[PDB]
Ligand binder design. Sequence first.
Ligand SMILES: CC(=O)N[C@@H]1[C@@H](O[C@@H]2O[C@H](CO)[C@H](O)[C@H](O)[C@H]2O)[C@H](O[C@@H]2O[C@@H](C)[C@@H](O)[C@@H](O)[C@@H]2O)[C@@H](CO)O[C@H]1O
Ligand SMILES: CC(=O)N[C@@H]1[C@@H](O[C@@H]2O[C@H](CO)[C@H](O)[C@H](O)[C@H]2O)[C@H](O[C@@H]2O[C@@H](C)[C@@H](O)[C@@H](O)[C@@H]2O)[C@@H](CO)O[C@H]1O
Lengths: 282, 290
Amino acid sequence: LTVPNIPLNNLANSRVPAMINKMTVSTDQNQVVQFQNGRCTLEGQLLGTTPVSASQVARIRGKVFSTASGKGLNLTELDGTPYHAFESPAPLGFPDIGACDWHVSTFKVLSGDPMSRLDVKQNAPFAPHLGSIEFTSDQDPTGDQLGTLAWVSPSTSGARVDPWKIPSYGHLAPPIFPPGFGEAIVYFMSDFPIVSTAQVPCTLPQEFVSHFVEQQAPVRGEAALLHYVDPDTHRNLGEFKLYPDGFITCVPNTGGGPQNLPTNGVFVFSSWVSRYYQLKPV
Amino acid sequence: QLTVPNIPLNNLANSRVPAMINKMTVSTDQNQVVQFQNGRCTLEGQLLGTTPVSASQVARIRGKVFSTASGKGLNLTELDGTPYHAFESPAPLGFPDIGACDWHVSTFKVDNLSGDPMSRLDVKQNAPFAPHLGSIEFTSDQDPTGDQLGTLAWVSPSTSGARVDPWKIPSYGESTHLAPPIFPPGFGEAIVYFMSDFPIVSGNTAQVPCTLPQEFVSHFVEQQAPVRGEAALLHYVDPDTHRNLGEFKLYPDGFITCVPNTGGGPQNLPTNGVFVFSSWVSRYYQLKPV
Ligand SMILES: CC(=O)N[C@@H]1[C@@H](O[C@@H]2O[C@H](CO)[C@H](O)[C@H](O)[C@H]2O)[C@H](O[C@@H]2O[C@@H](C)[C@@H](O)[C@@H](O)[C@@H]2O)[C@@H](CO)O[C@H]1O
Ligand SMILES: CC(=O)N[C@@H]1[C@@H](O[C@@H]2O[C@H](CO)[C@H](O)[C@H](O)[C@H]2O)[C@H](O[C@@H]2O[C@@H](C)[C@@H](O)[C@@H](O)[C@@H]2O)[C@@H](CO)O[C@H]1O
């Protein structure tokens, strides 16, 4: 097993199309998350709606159809092949930013302005598991539309967007529980236009996901001990544990944590360790 | 030891636009020379041109809005906001390389958002287009200010009568330190182009070619493998049956070739195959047609 030999700031977010710009721990270190993207086991098994490429993250494709009030999308996979309402929560790569309006910029798969912005609410007709969502748009999209989540905003006036939530979809990756004993889940944060924190967290950089899928490495221990290394001085900046279920922890120093580390370090696999191997605080 | 990504073609990203690869092809003129600045990396992991590491850096722009007596522009930075220094690159890393057309780039202001946060920056590749020196002019129907970060959304012709040719690169300048041209390397070989659907208005097709899938680029950067021959022989393999569907050569300078059958080529291959490194071979190794 290896992890990507790529500095953190050259890694992509796995929940929105953006680069990672810092790490952090949650304000409540017992907080449980259940992100559906950026989920993959160390052996390379994708979970939830997680796709392989950073260019599949938080994208939607579907055929426009007429609903009672306007238009909707009958979803397909991003490659245009049919979506089958089966075991996954939604088509692969479907956004997982819950409890907010989405604004998705799509094109018809040209003359004039080719873009449509689809404004999607997560209310009753939002049924991505079944394969359909509704939208309003100031443009006139028709046919086969492919696009990318552009920004998010509150579901109702006065509400706030919490990008730590996931949608109700109508094989949902399981919750990630802080494993105890002072360890805290490490979240990888990206700037992203959120109207009304304005950073989106994820639990694995996208290139970690493709790395695990590509490598199909056997898991040889209860956790993988990683070092976060300065690529210029080659000094070890901190210890992290990578768990088989596909998330990373550290022991954050009180009043601090991985948010105080440089954002240009490289994670390097060091050794397999037991589940209760104690980390040096960071 | 050199490997290539164990990822099927349809799960690979384009290295010139933010899109997934949906097929391979060869150019209609098989002697056509290209000089793309993104998707460029040697087998030893040396990035060339403006090529970034991540698929989510591809064809993106960041900069600070400034005004002139005549209009507005962006003073470019790198995508992480750090200063862009004109040195040995054509532009900031990840900067689009779709030449000779108007660009339409959707940006947001980095940091307390209210209302519609997006601005569409309309960029012309005329005189004020000087990304190598670190600035471009734009017009916009919105009101972007401050630190704007965004992604190429679509492209359209420079003039009314014109077409978009996504096989061209910009004029970045003046010496701009371009990644060198890629010539078809002889022995009946044709460069393999990886295509993605993308909104090109008034292109002959709505597709953008690139010469390396983006995950190949990051793979080479990570691996930092030594080059041990004049070319790497690859097989394109069906992941279910494990059978070899065709021979390809991967060159040290960072591109892939095949010998296409007359009237055909890799465009006729299934799109769910995986490239696998086979062996190092001589420059003169003659490929079986595909
Ligand atoms: C449909 C539409 O055009 N709505 C505009 C408002 O934005 C909507 O806000 C609601 C919640 O209030 C919801 O997020 C929709 O998805 C938004 O499209 C707009 O409100 C202003 O901008 C919003 C994004 C909101 O977040 C806030 O910034 C502000 O109230 C109003 C005001 O210009 O115009 C509406 O047309
Ligand atoms: C500034 C503007 O919005 N102009 C509209 C034209 O779009 C511009 O076309 C020029 C080239 O003529 C260039 O591509 C700019 O980037 C565009 O913004 C528009 O042209 C029509 O739509 C274009 C996207 C393109 O498909 C063109 O072939 C087509 O004629 C014209 C016509 O609607 O209106 C202009 O106001």
